[PDB]
Paper text:
Ferritin represents a class of natural protein nanocages, which is an iron storage protein that widely exists in nature. Ferritin consists of 24 subunits that self-assemble into a 432-point symmetrical cage-like structure with 12 of the two-fold, 8 of the 3-fold, and 6 of the 4-fold channels. The ferritin nanocage structure endows it with unique functions: the primary function of ferritin is to store iron while playing an important role in detoxification of iron and oxygen-related radical products in vivo. In this study, for the first time, we demonstrated that the ferritin from kuruma prawns (Marsupenaeus japonicus), named MjF, has a pronouncedly larger ability to resist denaturation induced by Cd2+ and Hg2+ as compared to its analogue, human H-chain ferritin (HuHF), despite the fact that these two proteins share a high similarity in protein structure.
To obtain direct evidence for the binding of Hg2+ and Cd2+ to MjF, we tried to crystallize MjF upon mixing with heavy metal ions (Hg2+ and Cd2+, respectively) by screening a wide range of solution conditions at 20 °C. Eventually, we were able to crystallize both complexes of MjF plus Hg2+ and MjF plus Cd2+ with good diffraction and solved their structure at a resolution of 2.3 Å (I4 space group) and 3.0 Å (P6322 space group), respectively. Similarly, the crystal structure of the complex of MjF and Cd2+ revealed that there are also 24 Cd2+ occurring at the protein shell, and that Cd2+ also coordinates with Cys13 but with relatively low occupancies. However, Cd2+ binds to Asp125 instead of Asn123 which is used for coordination with Hg2+. Thus, it seems that these two heavy metal ions exhibit higher selectivity for Cys residues in protein. In contrast, each MjF subunit only contains one Cys residue at position 13, which is located within the 3-fold channel. Consequently, it is hard for Hg2+ or Cd2+ to cross-link MjF molecules through its coordination with Cys13 residues due to seriously steric hindrance. Since there are 24 subunits per ferritin molecule, these findings suggest that each subunit may capture three Cd2+ in solution.
Numbering used by the authors:
A (entry chain B), B (entry chain D), C (entry chain D), D (entry chain B): 2 to 56, 58 to 99, 101 to 172
Write the structure that this text describes.
Amino acid sequence: ASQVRQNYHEDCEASINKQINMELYASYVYLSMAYYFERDDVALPGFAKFFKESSDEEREHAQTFMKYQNKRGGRIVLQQIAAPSMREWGTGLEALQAALDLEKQVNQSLLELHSTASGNNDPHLTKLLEDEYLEEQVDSIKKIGDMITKLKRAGPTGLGEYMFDKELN
Amino acid sequence: ASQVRQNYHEDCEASINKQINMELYASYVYLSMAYYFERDDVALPGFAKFFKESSDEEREHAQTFMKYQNKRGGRIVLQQIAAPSMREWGTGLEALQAALDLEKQVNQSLLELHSTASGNNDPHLTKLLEDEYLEEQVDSIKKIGDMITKLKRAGPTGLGEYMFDKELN
Amino acid sequence: ASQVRQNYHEDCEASINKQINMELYASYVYLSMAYYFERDDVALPGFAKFFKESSDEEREHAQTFMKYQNKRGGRIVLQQIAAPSMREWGTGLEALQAALDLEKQVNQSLLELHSTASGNNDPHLTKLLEDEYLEEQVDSIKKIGDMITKLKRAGPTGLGEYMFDKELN
Amino acid sequence: ASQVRQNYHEDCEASINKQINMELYASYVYLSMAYYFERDDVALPGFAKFFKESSDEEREHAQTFMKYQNKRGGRIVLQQIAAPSMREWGTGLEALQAALDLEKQVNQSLLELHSTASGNNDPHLTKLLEDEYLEEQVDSIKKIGDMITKLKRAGPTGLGEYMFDKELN
Ligand SMILES: [Fe+3]
Ligand SMILES: [Fe+3]
Ligand SMILES: [Fe+3]
Ligand SMILES: [Fe+3]
């Protein structure tokens, strides 16, 4: 064990590692989405910049978990990162319904982790998750939900999608 | 009691108290509409900003009458504020016609209050109403009218509404 | 309907709607007190400014819950806002003890709402309540307490109240 | 008659002259009050500055009436100015109850004049009075009423009056 380790149970150390992987996976789906919308036969630069910033952001989240793992005395164990579930991501609206569901799975994974931290009476870890991750996921979800409604209104394809893309840039 | 009351009749004092309630109700209707247009399944932020400013400006008008009541010597009587007729305000065009409707009611009330003021030979109260309320009300009716015409032209729903929303923002 | 709702239970949604009403009522009580202390026969402008800011900060809290309801997926239900228990709030000290009383009621409500949030394992709702409401409420109770003690020392009426008013300004 | 005179009835010309005198008289009472409070055995510099500014202000009002008399084609007829009703003005509170009543008489005289202007269908003159004089008198009255209440609270004499005077400076 570690010299700084205090009130840090093996269960929570294990879930932070699985969470790290999950965040890297989401970062990777989003990176895949960013350059999909930069294809000449797609050409949605607003959508691309948006999923690029999302990929950055998820990768940021993984690093903060890694830093926390070290801060409490746990040990970072890095696993394989899966291929993006798709190689081609469809229409703008389809890519957004995808990210909505993906941020929801992550939200679900984070809430299960907060439950683990309560159960093990780790107030430091519950505060971490309530302040850096659960706040972030709920805002992210609401933002994409707004976007899905806005994009459906403009017409999810054709001229409306062209205009919506501009406003996302 | 009061030491400033001069040429201030009781049915004008009563009218002002009843007007303060009407203004607070309208403030709460526009507040209601404000947040309706933030629901993730409505997502019309321009409509939301326009109605939040409207809630503000109506609450201001109520405050201004409260200040007036005291300036003249009358006594403020605040009644309960009715719940808005709706929880869901429908489409952007339906909410605009609701506001147009509502502004005209407030205008009619204000014009009755102006009449009562003349009837009792209160030139101060008429001046207050003419400079502070009837001027603003007729302006605000003309604007919501312009808005309704523009929105019907842009196509009341669809891409047009998405575009008309962005100008309101 | 909503596309963002995740881990958002109905009795928390209901509590938030009932809390929004409570906040709007308190906003209207402080509004009432605000203008009471402007009557030409009361003329306590420091007390008036303190209660007008209080009306503002309570209306803000209601708005913040409204924003939260939408962020989580719940649906805002606005009820009628009761008329304040009084039209004349008595002396400066009597109005302060009224506010102290009222703030504690809101605090008790908020603490019940926090309890309901834990009961349903909503760590987001507890975090919202802890950072946004319980923190501000306990601060505001401590301030009105300090105020009440100072005003009783300065002599609750008389010259002391005239002087204590000027500090509040 | 005059080359610019249009829709200006002899009645309204006559009342503007009596009003001019009245304003000069009030200016003169206030000048008398200003230097009363500068006596070594009184020494209330706040009260003095306040009635000095009032004397200025009333004298200003008389001039604006004179200018209006010329603007419409009437002719300024200047009468004797009475001695101030008192040579010694008593306590601070007594001087303020005096000015309150004096501004009320003037308000009464102005309202009678507005009535004359309505009766003669002179919209220019009713607008003049509603915008430069009735607005001014109601504010003045409310201000002095506030002051009478504030001063009674501080204790209308002794230490409280000393402190109130400072705040008026
Ligand atoms: Fe993440
Ligand atoms: Fe209004
Ligand atoms: Fe509150
Ligand atoms: Fe005057």
